[PDB]
């Protein structure tokens, strides 16, 4: 399997264009409200939707007479209605028995089909699932169907749907006109695809379809050409920066460089030259550039530029050298002069952004560039390319099983967690179910139950935390020190007890009203152990309301985990059965299945209060890699301060 | 957590000598000092409620920060404080009493400024917080020992900064 | 170190230190004089406890420096007498300190895995210390021995 | 900053692989001087030709004082 | 984890089709090779500590690794390497019964690189170590299973990097 | 980013009220520091590749990195630590410049951490590096401008941890 | 401030400092005794500025106080006035930066967008500083009222 | 120079010269006459500025003057004093433009590329120019030395 995630964000391809679609997207793109061009679009369509809906209606109920007598016309020797699911170039008519039933099963649906898609089409008002949907269909349909059957079966349905309507001239041409484009782009055979070139070797070749990018809703493409009003002059220009600032600014903050925007005007710059100048602009620098790091810097000014995020690892590598050497000026510069610039926009367009409709994608960085193409982008300063890219080649990282954000700080209280909505850096990778997390033990490295499971009730001895147990008798155990002993010795130790039982649930000293007297008593009493004190403060309300109600699910099940037993999850297997308890059973069933565990028993007695036992390697990382508390023989050479021999 | 006995020792032992002039210099020098920190700490430790209760006074009350609005409004936040504070002067203490600042790092400023961070926490009205903490405990506890308070008070806020 | 234990102490119990704690601490701060004395004297005189001791063990013990022994050679004894000299190195740093934590954390601790694995006898090394102690404590003053053969015997008691 | 005056046509190669929209491929551009180097070389090798290049910003032989 | 024998199943679980005559091929070859498998196990079981004695004299000892200052001079430290290179030759032992490197991505390698970077675990000196298992290994089993040994050897190594 | 006159003026500006004289104090600190700090700037900048060239040779050099099997073994990797360096440097000098570290919380550590796990780049050394840096720089400028160039070269290791 | 103004031009280069740029910092840094003495002038008689333009603003401009106006009421003439009380803030926090980054960063960028949606006359406003330009000429001398209103004439020219 | 990257940063923002950047260019203008006078000390001595550190850099590094060197030869070595002139006329353009510009643009840019070319060791360059600015710190007061001095030692900051 895969050793990294870059994300799986929600695709949504356009399998056709509507009207309304059609519309809407054109002013969305943009920026604009619609204005009476848009809307008369939709005026038109609208009142004609009223007709259109007659169209179907009729066509949708005597859909079983059409395909009959298309099917009756085209097919010879029997009857081809047995098993229902004007010009001839020379067609001969196919025998029912010698096609095969499998084969007559599919030529029936696919005539049904066509008027299926023909109703859908008068419905829409747009012919795009038509030209989609028929052009690339003549090749793959030659090679066990023969074409001079087909043009004759649409031919049929075209005379056999304008008889069976038959309303008016402003109606039926409609259905005449959608037709005759269904048979035109049947006629045609197969376009070459479309072919995205690697722009270097790093960088893999693809090929898309003539069909894909024939309904995925075409990107609006500006070029300035110096002859231009200046009213598209000005949408050019507003689209340049909607491209390079992700957004029109010059709308928004009426923040423009009218020293620019006059030299492209006339023609003195290219367009090519001018997003080069934007780029380098102190305008871009302070926005794109001066609040992220160099390796998110670099990643935004890939989609600026290029509209794309960077497709391979060395791509990466190679652009951060180049960032390091003249900064931002230089990457521009490496970015504008590229052979891949020139050769989508050229000199005259205006970069725009190449997604999933517009060519054909890679399997590489498909998450990182969903996320990149989102507005949402320049809030995510954690660099997404190559921290996916690097972690590709790497084996699986240290992180739980269901993602980074699930690993909360390990801190003495207090359940943090890193938000997926508040500064983006979900950093998901492809756990499977028996895969254990290495983790560091507080104590000796020897007493560690991966490699010595017999040692798990063993105490760590002042390398890890301070273990508490109630040893000593509790006060008014034995009927010794009779009525009176004001000063019994005993009752400190098992106070300190309390408080740590307390600390070691809720991570902080509680407050006056929210200590259970109740418990605690009983515990002094010794009618309770230490075992069923600690199950009473995690069944605790409050418990319920500070840590497992305002927290994920999942997140809260593996602070209780790190708080009941000291030692995050390893894998899969634990979190999935206290999850599994979580859904069916309850949150106070997941408190029981954490104290009556084996594990739990083994590490702690009746008497023993819990102890962080392991740590995440990068908790451990948080505690002991600072300025203090860094030993100078972690990772450093060492060398012997000796005395010289002339001193 | 390593005191300045420990600190001495991991260095030599770290080089794999044995305790030299220079280290045993380095010890002599905190067992001067031991009389200064033990009877710092007794004073910290008998007025400890006292320190913070100075301090919020001086820095955070009567502010936005109380008021509505503000992130140490509710009662709840209002404790949570309280008990920041009474944290931060009892880990600085326990520095005092060390004489390294290895257990702030290790326990206290471990990932605190992600957490201040994603609770909303101002840090600049914490810092103050601790800066009032540092003047309150001079004036308590004298100058030479108040001066060494006032250096992991300050290793704090450098931390949460 | 007893500062240490006394920190870590109150940190568990996330309290002030006990003034019975903080008057541990200041009576190991006024008898830190007496701890450096005795340190000092093991530092000064190393190579003669080592010697003396090396020496004493391989008349006691003669199986593990003749031929098929684990100490056997110019350089295996060498060896033997480095080990001695990084074990008298952790009780000083256990003097020093006041607390037997340095001796544990440093060459006490994974003490009976390393040298099952070396395949050195362990009771050999518990010997070799057992006879540095005796080396130290007739160097020494009574008071000064009594105070330094509580870290020994802590090291002879683990590994044994 | 010294800018040069370049006219080029630059042919595109893969247009018909690509199935990109057509492009004005003749243009009359100021390129920077710190660029033109790789302006240059980037044209050529797409097999573009390049017809006039004309010194429109800067003094021929300047020593100090360019951009 | 996977062994050769599961990675079949799952292969064929997942087509939904029982076990064709490629699928009764490939488990054949591991039958066929599973007696060398399991007597090369049996002499590592038995030759468990004296694999990694002559692995570690070979590299880690006498060097600046084990002397002070180095990451394998502590005792503690020591004894922890030894059980490393206890997991290195069970686990590749383990994987080299399997057929598959399978439970070496999910247990051994599962975020190794991140532990070893935190504790300031040396990467060379360790990788160096498991070449010094293997050169042992494959003197001690043999030169057809040792060197089958060595590609789950190689793939903690190579993880490693 | 945010320079010391920027972070004061923020601070009042939040408020909504006018620069007072505690405020204006703040100011007046930085113009008295302004000349040592232009003139420390100047000194690393002239060994902006000599600072580094100690450090890396106190710290990185002749250990577990630079040899087979770290992180530092091919020339592109050891050439990216030295650009590494180089950028903890640049960007000391520009906080020390500035008088508050808000470049290095925007520029150089806000998601360096997660790249420095991605890679595999061990951060517990790089730290070191880090502070082989802070004690040439000090040696080089001085006592009063090496403290100041410390504090955000020790931010740098604060955030990297 | 220009020290910030050189870092990021530094930082957009991914250059140290230039002396050039350095010799700036000093020279700004010196001569930053001037700059504290006019903002302390500027925010000593903070109201007395305000209360004295914004009466002019209305007598010259009538028609703002008019009915049908924009600062017509009660309550829009004290928002205007507060208005003003926010531009000269923000000037303050420009003569003390000593430079024209912090007026624009908080209260200069989208300006024309702002009083466009709230009703207000862009110009007007242009005028409200102009008049506390003047007013606060007048309560300095001749070199410092010069320096403050560099930063008001700013202000005034970015609007209208 | 300093008023040239000035205008070049107004021009980028499009925009003119900040009321804190025409003060930049008064406090550069005003201490003109100190630029010169640091110039005109550079220039008036130039034979025994480079005669002194030209010795000092044989004296340093012999290698150079060594047979297999670079500059070995009456011809080889009058070539090496040349270049050091060269790079002192740059400095007094430098100093007199306020700004390491000149410097760049005429003998700084493509310096690593030109010296690779030729043979000549980088670091035994460096070197020269820094024996051209111990005897300039000698010859010129304190004053005028340390503002000279960061323009020597982005010479040399960049040869090395
Ligand atoms: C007081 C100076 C300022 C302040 C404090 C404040 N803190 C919280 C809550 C928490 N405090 C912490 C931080 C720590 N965890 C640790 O491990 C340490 C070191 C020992 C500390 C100091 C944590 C984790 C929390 C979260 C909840 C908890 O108590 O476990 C709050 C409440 C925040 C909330 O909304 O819940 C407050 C207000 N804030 C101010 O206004 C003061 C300037
Ligand atoms: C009056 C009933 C009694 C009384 C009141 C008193 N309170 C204070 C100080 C404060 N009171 C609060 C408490 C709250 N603020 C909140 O947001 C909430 C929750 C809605 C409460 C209950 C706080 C935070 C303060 C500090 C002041 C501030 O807000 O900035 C005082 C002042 C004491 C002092 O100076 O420390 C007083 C007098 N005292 C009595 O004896 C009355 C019976
Ligand atoms: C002498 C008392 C006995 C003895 C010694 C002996 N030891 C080794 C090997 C090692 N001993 C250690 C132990 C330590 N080094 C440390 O850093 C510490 C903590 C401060 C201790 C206690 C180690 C690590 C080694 C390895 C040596 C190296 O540096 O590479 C040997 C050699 C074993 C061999 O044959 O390889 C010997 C002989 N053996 C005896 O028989 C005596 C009883
Ligand atoms: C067909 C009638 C004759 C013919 C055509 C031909 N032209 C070219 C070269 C190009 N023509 C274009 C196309 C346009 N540029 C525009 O801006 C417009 C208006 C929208 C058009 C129509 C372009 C851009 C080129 C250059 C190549 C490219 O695709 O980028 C060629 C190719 C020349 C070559 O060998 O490269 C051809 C063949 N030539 C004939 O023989 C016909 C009589
Ligand atoms: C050296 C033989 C003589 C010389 C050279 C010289 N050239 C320039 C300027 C440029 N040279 C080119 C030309 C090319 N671009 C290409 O595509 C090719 C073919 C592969 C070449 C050779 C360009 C584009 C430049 C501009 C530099 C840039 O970075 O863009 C100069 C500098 C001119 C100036 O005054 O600045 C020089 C000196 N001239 C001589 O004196 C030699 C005899
Ligand atoms: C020996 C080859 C090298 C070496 C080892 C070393 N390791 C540690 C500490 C730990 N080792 C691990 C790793 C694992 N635990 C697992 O579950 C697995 C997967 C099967 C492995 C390999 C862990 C988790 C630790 C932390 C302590 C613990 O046991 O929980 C150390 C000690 C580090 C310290 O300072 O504590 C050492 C020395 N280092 C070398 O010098 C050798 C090259
Ligand atoms: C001998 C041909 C010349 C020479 C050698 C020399 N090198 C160093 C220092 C190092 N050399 C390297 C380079 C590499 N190690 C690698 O792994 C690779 C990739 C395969 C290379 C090219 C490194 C990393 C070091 C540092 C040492 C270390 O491993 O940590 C020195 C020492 C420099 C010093 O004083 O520190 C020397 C002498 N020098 C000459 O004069 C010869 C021409
Ligand atoms: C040197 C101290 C240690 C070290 C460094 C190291 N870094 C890389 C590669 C990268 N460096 C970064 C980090 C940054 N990006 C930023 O935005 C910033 C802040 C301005 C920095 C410093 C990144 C993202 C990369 C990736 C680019 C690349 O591939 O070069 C490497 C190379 C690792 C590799 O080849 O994958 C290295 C070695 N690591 C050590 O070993 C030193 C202790």
Same mark, same amino acid.
Not at chain 1, 74 to 80: E, K, Q
Not at chain 1, 246 to 265: C, G, N, P
Not at chain 1, 317 to 331: R, T
Not at chain 2, 133 to 158: F, H, Q, R
């Given at each position: 399997?895969?050793?990294?995630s870059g994300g799986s964000s929600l695709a949504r391809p356009q399998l056709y264009?509507?009207?309304?679609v059609?519309?809407?997207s054109?002013?969305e793109?943009?920026?604009?409200?619609?204005?009476?061009?848009?809307?008369?679009?939709?005026?038109?369509?609208?009142?004609?939707?009223?007709?259109?809906?007659?169209?179907?209606?009729?066509?949708?109920?005597?859909?079983?007479?059409?395909?009959?007598?298309?099917?009756?016309?085209?097919?010879?020797?029997?009857?081809?209605?047995?098993?229902?699911?004007?010009?001839?170039?020379?067609?001969?008519?196919?025998?029912?028995?010698?096609?095969?039933?499998?084969?007559?099963?599919?030529?029936?649906?696919?005539?049904?089909?066509?008027?299926?898609?023909?109703?859908?089409?008068?419905?829409?008002?747009?012919?795009?699932?038509?030209?989609?949907?028929?052009?690339?269909?003549?090749?793959?349909?030659?090679?066990?169907?023969?074409?001079?059957?087909?043009?004759?079966?649409?031919?049929?349905?075209?005379?056999?749907?304008?008889?069976?309507?038959?309303?008016?001239?402003?109606?039926?041409?409609?259905?005449?006109?959608?037709?005759?484009?269904?048979?035109?782009?049947?006629?045609?055979?197969?376009?070459?695809?479309?072919?995205?070139?690697?722009?270097?070797?790093?960088?893999?070749?693809?090929?898309?379809?003539?069909?894909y990018?024939?309904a995925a809703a075409?990107?609006?493409?500006?070029?300035?050409?110096?002859?231009?009003?200046?009213?598209?002059?000005?949408?050019?220009?507003?689209?340049?920066?909607?491209?390079?600032?992700?957004?029109?600014?010059?709308?928004?903050?009426?923040?423009?460089?009218?020293?620019?925007?006059?030299?492209?005007?006339?023609?003195?710059?290219?367009?090519?030259?001018?997003?080069?100048?934007?780029?380098?602009?102190?305008?871009?620098?302070?926005?794109?550039?001066?609040?992220?790091?160099?390796?998110?810097?670099?990643?935004?000014?890939?989609?600026?530029?290029?509209?794309?995020g960077?497709?391979?690892?060395?791509?990466?590598?190679?652009?951060?050298?180049?960032?390091?050497?003249?900064?931002?000026?230089?990457?521009?510069?490496?970015?504008?002069?590229?052979?891949?610039?020139?050769?989508?926009?050229?000199?005259?367009?205006?970069?725009?952004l190449r997604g999933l409709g517009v060519?054909?994608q890679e399997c590489r960085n498909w998450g990182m560039q969903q996320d990149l193409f989102s507005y949402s982008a320049?809030?995510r300063?954690?660099?997404q390319?190559?921290?996916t890219?690097?972690?590709?080649?790497?084996?699986?990282?240290?992180?739980?099983?269901?993602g980074?954000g699930?690993?909360?700080?390990?801190?003495?209280?207090?359940?943090?967690?890193?938000?997926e909505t508040?500064?983006p850096?979900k950093?998901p990778?492809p756990?499977?179910?028996?895969?254990?997390?290495?983790?560091?033990?507080?104590?000796?490295?020897?007493?560690?139950?991966?490699?010595?499971?017999?040692?798990?009730?063993?105490?760590?001895?002042?390398?890890?935390?301070?273990?508490?147990?109630?040893?000593?008798?509790?006060?008014?155990?034995?009927?010794?020190?009779?009525?009176?002993?004001?000063?019994?010795?005993?009752?400190?130790?098992?106070?300190?007890?309390?408080?740590?039982?307390?600390?070691?649930?809720?991570?902080?000293?509680?407050?006056?009203?929210?200590?259970?007297?109740?418990?605690?008593?009983?515990?002094?009493?010794?009618?309770?152990?230490?075992?069923?004190?600690?199950?009473?403060?995690?069944?605790?309300?409050?418990?319920?309301?500070?840590?497992?109600?305002?927290?994920?699910?999942?997140?809260?099940?593996?602070?209780?985990?790190?708080?009941?037993?000291?030692?995050?999850?390893?894998?899969?297997?634990?979190?999935?059965?206290?999850?599994?308890?979580?859904?069916?059973?309850?949150?106070?069933?997941?408190?029981?299945?954490?104290?009556?565990?084996?594990?739990?028993?083994?590490?702690?007695?009746?008497?023993?209060?819990?102890?962080?036992?392991?740590?995440?390697?990068?908790?451990?990382?948080?505690?002991?890699?600072?300025?203090?508390?860094?030993?100078?023989?972690?990772?450093?050479?060492?060398?012997?301060?000796?005395?010289?021999?002339?001193? | 957590?390593?005191?300045?006995?420990?600190?001495?020792?991991?260095?030599?032992?770290?080089?794999?000598?044995?305790?030299?002039?220079?280290?045993?210099?380095?010890?002599?020098?905190?067992?001067?000092?031991?009389?200064?920190?033990?009877?710092?700490?007794?004073?910290?430790?008998?007025?400890?409620?006292?320190?913070?209760?100075?301090?919020?006074?001086?820095?955070?009350?009567?502010?936005?920060?109380?008021?509505?609005?503000?992130?140490?409004?509710?009662?709840?936040?209002?404790?949570?404080?309280?008990?920041?504070?009474?944290?931060?002067?009892?880990?600085?203490?326990?520095?005092?009493?060390?004489?390294?600042?290895?257990?702030?790092?290790?326990?206290?400023?471990?990932?605190?400024?992600?957490?201040?961070?994603?609770?909303?926490?101002?840090?600049?009205?914490?810092?103050?917080?601790?800066?009032?903490?540092?003047?309150?405990?001079?004036?308590?506890?004298?100058?030479?020992?108040?001066?060494?308070?006032?250096?992991?008070?300050?290793?704090?806020?450098?931390?949460?900064? | 170190?007893?500062?240490?234990?006394?920190?870590?102490?109150?940190?568990?119990?996330?309290?002030?230190?006990?003034?019975?704690?903080?008057?541990?601490?200041?009576?190991?701060?006024?008898?830190?004089?007496?701890?450096?004395?005795?340190?000092?004297?093991?530092?000064?005189?190393?190579?003669?406890?080592?010697?003396?001791?090396?020496?004493?063990?391989?008349?006691?013990?003669?199986?593990? %420096?003749?031929? =098929?022994?684990?100490?056997?050679? /110019? !350089?295996?004894?060498?060896?033997?007498? $480095?080990? #001695?000299?990084?074990? &008298?190195?952790?009780?000083?740093?256990? %003097?020093?300190? =006041?607390?037997?934590?340095?001796? /544990? !954390?440093?060459?006490?601790?994974?003490? $009976?895995? #390393?040298?099952?694995? &070396?395949?050195?006898?362990?009771?050999? %090394?518990?010997?070799?210390?057992?006879?540095?102690? /005796?080396?130290?404590?007739?160097?020494?003053?009574?008071?000064?021995?009594?105070?330094?053969?509580?870290?020994?015997?802590? %090291?002879?008691?683990?590994?044994? | 900053?010294?800018?040069?005056?370049?006219?080029?046509?630059?042919?595109?190669?893969?247009?018909?692989?690509?199935?990109?929209?057509?492009?004005?491929?003749?243009?009359?551009?100021?390129?920077?001087?710190?660029?033109?180097?790789?302006?240059?070389?980037?044209?050529?090798?797409?097999?573009?030709?390049?017809?006039?290049?004309?010194?429109?910003?800067?003094?021929?032989?300047?020593?100090?004082?360019?951009?």
């Open positions: 399997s895969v050793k990294a264009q509507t009207v309304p059609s519309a809407i054109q002013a793109q943009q920026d604009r409200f619609l204005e009476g061009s848009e809307l008369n679009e939709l005026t038109a369509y609208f009142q004609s939707g009223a007709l259109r809906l007659e169209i179907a209606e009729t066509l949708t109920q005597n859909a079983d007479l059409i395909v009959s007598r298309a099917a009756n016309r085209i097919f010879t020797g029997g009857s081809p209605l047995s098993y229902l699911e004007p010009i001839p170039p020379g067609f001969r008519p196919i025998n029912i028995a010698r096609y095969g039933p499998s084969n007559m099963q599919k030529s029936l649906r696919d005539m049904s089909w066509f008027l299926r898609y023909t109703t859908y089409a008068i419905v829409a008002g747009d012919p795009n699932i038509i030209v989609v949907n028929t052009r690339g269909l003549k090749e793959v349909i030659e090679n066990a169907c023969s074409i001079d059957a087909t043009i004759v079966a649409i031919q049929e349905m075209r005379a056999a749907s304008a008889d069976y309507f038959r309303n008016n001239a402003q109606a039926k041409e409609i259905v005449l006109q959608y037709f005759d484009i269904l048979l035109s782009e049947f006629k045609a055979p197969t376009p070459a695809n479309k072919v995205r070139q690697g722009p270097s070797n790093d960088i893999q070749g693809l090929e898309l379809p003539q069909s990018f024939n075409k990107r609006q493409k500006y070029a300035m050409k110096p002859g231009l009003s200046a009213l598209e002059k000005n949408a050019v220009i507003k689209a340049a920066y909607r491209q390079i600032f992700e957004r029109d600014i010059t709308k928004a903050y009426s923040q423009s460089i009218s020293y620019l925007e006059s030299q492209v005007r006339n023609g003195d710059i290219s367009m090519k030259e001018f997003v080069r100048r934007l780029a380098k602009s102190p305008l871009y620098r302070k926005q794109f550039f001066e609040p992220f790091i160099n390796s998110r810097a670099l990643e935004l000014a890939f989609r600026h530029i290029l509209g794309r960077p497709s391979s690892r060395e791509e990466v590598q190679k652009y951060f050298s180049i960032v390091s050497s003249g900064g931002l000026p230089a990457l521009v510069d490496a970015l504008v002069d590229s052979q891949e610039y020139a050769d989508y926009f050229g000199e005259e367009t205006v970069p725009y060519e054909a320049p809030f300063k954690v660099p390319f190559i921290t890219f690097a972690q590709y080649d790497r084996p699986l990282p240290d992180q739980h099983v269901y980074s699930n690993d909360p700080l390990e801190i003495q209280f207090g359940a943090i967690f890193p938000k508040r500064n850096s950093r990778a756990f499977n179910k028996d895969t254990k997390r290495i983790l560091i033990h507080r104590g000796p490295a020897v007493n560690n139950q991966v490699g010595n499971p017999s040692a798990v009730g063993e105490f760590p001895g002042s390398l890890g935390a301070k273990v508490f147990r109630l040893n000593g008798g509790l006060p008014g155990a034995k009927v010794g020190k009779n009525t009176g002993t004001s000063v019994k010795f005993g009752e400190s130790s098992t106070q300190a007890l309390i408080r740590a039982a307390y600390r070691q649930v809720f991570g902080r000293d509680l407050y006056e009203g929210q200590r259970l007297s109740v418990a605690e008593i009983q515990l002094e009493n010794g009618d309770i152990s230490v075992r069923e004190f600690i199950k009473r403060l995690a069944k605790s309300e409050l418990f319920l309301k500070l840590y497992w109600a305002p927290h994920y699910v999942c997140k809260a099940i593996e602070y209780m985990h790190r708080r009941l037993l000291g030692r995050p999850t390893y894998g899969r297997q634990e979190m999935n059965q206290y999850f599994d308890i979580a859904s069916k059973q309850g949150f106070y069933a997941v408190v029981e299945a954490m104290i009556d565990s084996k594990e739990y028993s083994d590490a702690f007695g009746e008497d023993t209060v819990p102890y962080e036992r392991y740590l995440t390697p990068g908790g451990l990382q948080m505690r002991s890699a600072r300025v203090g508390s860094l030993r100078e023989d972690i990772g450093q050479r060492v060398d012997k301060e000796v005395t010289p021999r002339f001193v | 957590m390593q005191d300045a006995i420990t600190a001495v020792i991991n260095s030599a032992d770290v080089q794999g000598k044995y305790l030299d002039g220079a280290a045993m210099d380095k010890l002599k020098s905190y067992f001067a000092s031991g009389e200064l920190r033990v009877r710092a700490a007794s004073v910290i430790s008998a007025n400890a409620a006292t320190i913070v209760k100075e301090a919020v006074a001086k820095s955070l009350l009567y502010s936005d920060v109380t008021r509505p609005g503000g992130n140490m409004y509710t009662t709840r936040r209002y404790a949570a404080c309280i008990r920041d504070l009474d944290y931060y002067l009892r880990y600085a203490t326990y520095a005092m009493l060390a004489g390294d600042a290895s257990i702030l790092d290790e326990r206290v400023l471990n990932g605190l400024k992600e957490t201040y961070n994603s609770l909303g926490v101002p840090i600049s009205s914490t810092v103050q917080a601790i800066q009032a903490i540092k003047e309150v405990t001079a004036s308590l506890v004298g100058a030479d020992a108040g001066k060494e308070m006032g250096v992991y008070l300050d290793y704090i806020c450098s931390g949460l900064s | 170190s007893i500062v240490t234990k006394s920190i870590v102490n109150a940190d568990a119990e996330a309290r002030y230190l006990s003034p019975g704690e903080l008057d541990r601490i200041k009576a190991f701060v006024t008898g830190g004089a007496a701890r450096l004395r005795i340190a000092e004297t093991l530092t000064g005189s190393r190579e003669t406890i080592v010697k003396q001791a090396g020496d004493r063990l391989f008349q006691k013990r003669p199986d593990i %420096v003749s031929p =098929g022994g684990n100490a056997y050679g /110019e !350089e295996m004894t060498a060896t033997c007498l $480095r080990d #001695m000299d990084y074990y &008298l190195r952790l009780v000083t740093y256990g %003097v020093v300190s =006041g607390d037997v934590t340095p001796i /544990e !954390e440093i060459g006490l601790v994974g003490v $009976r895995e #390393m040298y099952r694995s &070396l395949g050195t006898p362990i009771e050999a %090394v518990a010997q070799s210390v057992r006879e540095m102690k /005796e080396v130290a404590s007739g160097l020494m003053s009574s008071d000064d021995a009594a105070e330094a053969s509580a870290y020994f015997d802590f %090291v002879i008691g683990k590994m044994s | 900053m010294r800018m040069f005056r370049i006219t080029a046509c630059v042919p595109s190669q893969t247009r018909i692989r690509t199935q990109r929209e057509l492009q004005n491929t003749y243009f009359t551009k100021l390129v920077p001087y710190d660029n033109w180097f790789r302006e240059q070389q980037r044209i050529m090798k797409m097999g573009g030709k390049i017809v006039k290049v004309e010194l429109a910003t800067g003094r021929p032989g300047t020593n100090a004082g360019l951009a």
